[PDB]
Amino acid sequence: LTTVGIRGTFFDFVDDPWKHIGNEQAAARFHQDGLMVVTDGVIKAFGPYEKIAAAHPGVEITHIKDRIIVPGFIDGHIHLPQTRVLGAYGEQLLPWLQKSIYPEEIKYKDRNYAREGVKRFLDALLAAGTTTCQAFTSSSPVATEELFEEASRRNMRVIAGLTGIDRNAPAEFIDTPENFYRDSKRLIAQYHDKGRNLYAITPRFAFGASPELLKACQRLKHEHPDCWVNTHISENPAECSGVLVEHPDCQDYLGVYEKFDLVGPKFSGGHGVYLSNNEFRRMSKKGAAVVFCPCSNLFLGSGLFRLGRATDPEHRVKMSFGTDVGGGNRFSMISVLDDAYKVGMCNNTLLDGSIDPSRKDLAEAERNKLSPYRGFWSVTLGGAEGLYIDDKLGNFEPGKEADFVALDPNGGQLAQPWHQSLIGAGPRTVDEAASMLFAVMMVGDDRCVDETWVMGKRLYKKS
Amino acid sequence: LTTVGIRGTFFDFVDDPWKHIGNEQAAARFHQDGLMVVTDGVIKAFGPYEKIAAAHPGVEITHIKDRIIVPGFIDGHIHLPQTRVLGAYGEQLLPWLQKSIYPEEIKYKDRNYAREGVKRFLDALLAAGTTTCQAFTSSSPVATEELFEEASRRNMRVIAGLTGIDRNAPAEFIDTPENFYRDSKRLIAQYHDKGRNLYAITPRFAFGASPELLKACQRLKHEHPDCWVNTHISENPAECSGVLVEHPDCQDYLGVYEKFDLVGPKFSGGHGVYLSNNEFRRMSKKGAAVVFCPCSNLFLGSGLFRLGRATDPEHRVKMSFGTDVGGGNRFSMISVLDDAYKVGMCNNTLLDGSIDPSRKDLAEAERNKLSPYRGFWSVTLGGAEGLYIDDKLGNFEPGKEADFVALDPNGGQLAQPWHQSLIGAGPRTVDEAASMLFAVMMVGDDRCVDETWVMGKRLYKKS
Numbered sequence: 001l002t003t004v005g006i007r008g009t010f011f012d013f014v015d016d017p018w019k020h021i022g023n024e025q026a027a028a029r030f031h032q033d034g035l036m037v038v039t040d041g042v043i044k045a046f047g048p049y050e051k052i053a054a055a056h057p058g059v060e061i062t063h064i065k066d067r068i069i070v071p072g073f074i075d076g077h078i079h080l081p082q083t084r085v086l087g088a089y090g091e092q093l094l095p096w097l098q099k100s101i102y103p104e105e106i107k108y109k110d111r112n113y114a115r116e117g118v119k120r121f122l123d124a125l126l127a128a129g130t131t132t133c134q135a136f137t138s139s140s141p142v143a144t145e146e147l148f149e150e151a152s153r154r155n156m157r158v159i160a161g162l163t164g165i166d167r168n169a170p171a172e173f174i175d176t177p178e179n180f181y182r183d184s185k186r187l188i189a190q191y192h193d194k195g196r197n198l199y200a201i202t203p204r205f206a207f208g209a210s211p212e213l214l215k216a217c218q219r220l221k222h223e224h225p226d227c228w229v230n231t232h233i234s235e236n237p238a239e240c241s242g243v244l245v246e247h248p249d250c251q252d253y254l255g256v257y258e259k260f261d262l263v264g265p266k267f268s269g270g271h272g273v274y275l276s277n278n279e280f281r282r283m284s285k286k287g288a289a290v291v292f293c294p295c296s297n298l299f300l301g302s303g304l305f306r307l308g309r310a311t312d313p314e315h316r317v318k319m320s321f322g323t324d325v326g327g328g329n330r331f332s333m334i335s336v337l338d339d340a341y342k343v344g345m346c347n348n349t350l351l352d353g354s355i356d357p358s359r360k361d362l363a364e365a366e367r368n369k370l371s372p373y374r375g376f377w378s379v380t381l382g383g384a385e386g387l388y389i390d391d392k393l394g395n396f397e398p399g400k401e402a403d404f405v406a407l408d409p410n411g412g413q414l415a416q417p418w419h420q421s422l423i424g425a426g427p428r429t430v431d432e433a434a435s436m437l438f439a440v441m442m443v444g445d446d447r448c449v450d451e452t453w454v455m456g457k458r459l460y461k462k463s
Numbered sequence: 464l465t466t467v468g469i470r471g472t473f474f475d476f477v478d479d480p481w482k483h484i485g486n487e488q489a490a491a492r493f494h495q496d497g498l499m500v501v502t503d504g505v506i507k508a509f510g511p512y513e514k515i516a517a518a519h520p521g522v523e524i525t526h527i528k529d530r531i532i533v534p535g536f537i538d539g540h541i542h543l544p545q546t547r548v549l550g551a552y553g554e555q556l557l558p559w560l561q562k563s564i565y566p567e568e569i570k571y572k573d574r575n576y577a578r579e580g581v582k583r584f585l586d587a588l589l590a591a592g593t594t595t596c597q598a599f600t601s602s603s604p605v606a607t608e609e610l611f612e613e614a615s616r617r618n619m620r621v622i623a624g625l626t627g628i629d630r631n632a633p634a635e636f637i638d639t640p641e642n643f644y645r646d647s648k649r650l651i652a653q654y655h656d657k658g659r660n661l662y663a664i665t666p667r668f669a670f671g672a673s674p675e676l677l678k679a680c681q682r683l684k685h686e687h688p689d690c691w692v693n694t695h696i697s698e699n700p701a702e703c704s705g706v707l708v709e710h711p712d713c714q715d716y717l718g719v720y721e722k723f724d725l726v727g728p729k730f731s732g733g734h735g736v737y738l739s740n741n742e743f744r745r746m747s748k749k750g751a752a753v754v755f756c757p758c759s760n761l762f763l764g765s766g767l768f769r770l771g772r773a774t775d776p777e778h779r780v781k782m783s784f785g786t787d788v789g790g791g792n793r794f795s796m797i798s799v800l801d802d803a804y805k806v807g808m809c810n811n812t813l814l815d816g817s818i819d820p821s822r823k824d825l826a827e828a829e830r831n832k833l834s835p836y837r838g839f840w841s842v843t844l845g846g847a848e849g850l851y852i853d854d855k856l857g858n859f860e861p862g863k864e865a866d867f868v869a870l871d872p873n874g875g876q877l878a879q880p881w882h883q884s885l886i887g888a889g890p891r892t893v894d895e896a897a898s899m900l901f902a903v904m905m906v907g908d909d910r911c912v913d914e915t916w917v918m919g920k921r922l923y924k925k926s
């Protein structure tokens with residue numbers, strides 16, 4: 001039908017920066033002046049301008065000037081029904097769910113409210129740079145239906161599903177394991193793998209899931225092997241204690257999900273925070289992934305996710321970063337990277353022996369430094385592999401879907417542009433590009449997101 | 464000469480919220496529709512609209528509509544010469560100073576560069592909501608002179624001084640204790656208490672101050688009792704170790720400064736982070752103050768400032784929050800409050816016994832929750848008392864200087880206004896006001912700063 005070509009400064013990844021200590025540039029791919037040829041929303045050719053322009057004689061080239069074009073940000077952990085309540089005051093995980101979250105999520109039972117939230121949810125995500133997300137919904141199929149459908153109109157790849165909740169929640173909010181299986185089964189029928197929609201069996205979290213509800217998820221996963229599994233794991237100490245109480249026959253939090261064959265490829269456990277090295281090794285082995293949500297971890301007091309452990313090359317764990325809106329107070333992955341770096345630097349101090357020498361470990365302390373290479377790989381290619389959708393997204397490789405963002409390195413607080421000028425203007429090398437991207441992360445915010453494209457179509461453009 | 468009256472929704476403090484557990488509203492003062500009469504930049508009358516409008520028949524009332532007017536934010540710890548380098552990658556305190564800070568601060572030797580930095584420094588502060596700040600400069604008198612003078616043109620109250628550095632820094636950057644005393648003496652002459660300028664004897668930090676340099680500060684403080692003392696204390700573990708090495712004859716970091724009579728009223732020690740309860744008690748007793756810089760503490764990996772300990776009612780320590788630009792990555796006190804709350808919530812989890820019951824302490828765990836009352840009192844009245852300038856600033860009490868900010872509760876990321884609407888529109892009670900201010904802190908950023916006034920004069924107005 002149509003074929004357009006995007007021109008400008010491009011920056012993406014072809015490998016994991018963690019795999020290149022002291023030489024991360026090798027994981028990045030930079031084109032000061034490149035051209036991407038997208039046909040019907042699919043990359044067909046990527047490379048330097050001349051060479052590509054020449055191989056494609058008459059294509060309509062759209063020139064995004066003075067920006068750094070990167071792949072659309074992947075957010076592996078948001079709560080759709082929490083879009084309106086992301087700054088609840090005073091509570092840790094548990095009392096907060098009861099006090100501020102459930103009373104709001106219950107409103108999504110009403111289809112009109114659900115439709116409006118879904119609209120605002122997706123608008124906030126686009127204005128933030130996020131083109132793909134794995135979303136939690138409420139226990140009512142309504143919110144899930146409205147989300148998949150509005151996602152279709154914008155034709156965005158999205159992972160979502162009915163979020164079952166069995167115990168420890170209001171009676172009017174929880175719903176029977178039977179109905180959950182029934183509804184999830186219906187929703188998988190109507191939405192899974194239709195267009196860019198992907199379904200995820202979603203037992204909210206062990207603490208709120210009776211063994212019947214989890215047994216239901218097990219059945220669902222068995223009758224629908226292609227479906228994803230999305231949940232929470234080891235986020236709060238009180239939560240961890242309760243879980244082993246609600247599930248007396250299990251050794252660790254991850255053990256609860258393994259008892260039902262939920263752990264393996266396409267499994268995402270939000271908030272590592274309190275996972276043991278054993279639990280990390282097990283996930284690495286089975287291919288399960290963890291979602292690092294720093295903004296939330298800090299806002300709710302959960303703690304410091306051990307980034308250096310999950311990235312251990314001997315037992316590498318698959319990951320995707322997350323905003324965790326509700327728990328987290330920011331919709332942008334750029335804001336997530338800000339807190340992600342902070343958590344990692346605090347970890348660096350805990351592992352260098354400056355305090356307790358017996359806990360020292362420089363290799364891990366080094367892995368906690370979130371460079372612009374590591375941070376941006378994590379919200380794109382890395383997040384794609386962590387969600388097992390790297391065949392469709394992650395970078396500008398031909399054959400992948402064309403979701404992308406035009407970053408304005410000068411956006412953000414007043415201090416940004418004089419800071420960025422330390423590098424005149426436009427980035428001329430992969431190092432200068434990486435250097436400005438770190439400034440986007442730490443000195444700027446969503447004001448750096450100038451344009452958000454989905455399938456070769458520009459859905460957003462900062463006023 | 465002139466007399467103007469500001470009208471609109473006002474919110475300020477008359478007491479410490481910490482002093483009112485379970486009833487913080489009592490520390491706040493709310494006027495849904497009030498009028499402030501300022502004559503030549505000095506509050507002359509404050510109170511509800513009618514009553515004030517009536518007592519002042521023909522005053523030019525300027526109506527700031529749809530905003531929440533609060534006192535100008537006090538920032539007790541910024542580094543002027545670091546304005547351009549606030550997002551340096553990969554290092555903890557020490558290696559970072561060597562790698563990214565000194566090479567930039569040395570440029571301020573040149574008066575043209577210094578003049579431009581001072582300009583950008585103050586612009587960033589105003590666009591951020593900060594009207595008063597205690598600033599660190601470089602070792603060259605130039606940067607200090609240019610700062611005081613540009614502060615005069617805008618007529619802003621500012622605490623600053625020659626930042627002496629003796630050891631552990633480049634040779635071209637450090638300067639003799641003699642010259643330091645000489646120059647500081649000159650600068651105190653020309654600037655201290657002239658207009659709204661206040662001088663602070665500034666030994667950068669024990670680690671970089673030979674006993675001669677500190678003995679010089681002692682002399683200065685003795686010949687100029689009215690001058691402030693500004694420095695750093697216990698920010699990094701490696702830094703703490705080095706200090707006790709560079710000062711073998713002292714027991715604790717605070718002990719180094721007491722050896723020279725620097726600790727007492729008007730003393731500010733940046734970054735509590737590694738202070739002992741004994742050190743806190745000593746400061747509380749002598750009246751010295753600590754400056755909590757959460758953004759910096761997290762960015763450099765320093766750690767979690769024990770907010771609950773400094774606010775201990777039996778040994779209350781005077782405070783002022785700080786951005787610490789350079790170390791910190793944000794110029795706004797609103798952004799500082801975001802990380803301040805996060806540090807405090809992580810502390811709440813460490814003190815509630817959910818992990819180690821022997822370390823439990825609910826009274827302190829409670830004091831770590833940064834409510835909109837506690838947070839905003841800290842960046843205004845609280846910060847004023849912590850800097851001993853509460854006679855001139857802090858709130859809208861008649862006789863105080865009229866520095867203020869018009870906050871737009873709807874500013875910030877896309878999600879803000881649907882979130883704030885959970886309260887139709889305009890705040891009708893002190894609770895609704897506090898409720899929206901917490902959303903300013905956590906869901907918004909500097910985009911919430913619509914107007915910044917200094918001495919009854921509007922210096923800034925968001926485009």
Ligand SMILES: Nc1nc2[nH]cnc2c(=O)[nH]1
Pocket residue numbers: 093094097204205232235270296324327
């Ligand atoms: N992100 C998040 N997920 C949850 N699942 C159950 N409780 C929580 C929570 O507090 N935060």
Ligand SMILES: Nc1nc2[nH]cnc2c(=O)[nH]1
Pocket residue numbers: 556557560667668695698733759787790
């Ligand atoms: N804020 C801050 N002050 C200092 N004084 C000496 N070193 C430091 C540092 O790393 N950060």
Ligand SMILES: [Zn+2]
Pocket residue numbers: 077078079136232270324327
């Ligand atoms: Zn979650």
Ligand SMILES: [Zn+2]
Pocket residue numbers: 540541542599695733787790
């Ligand atoms: Zn400092």
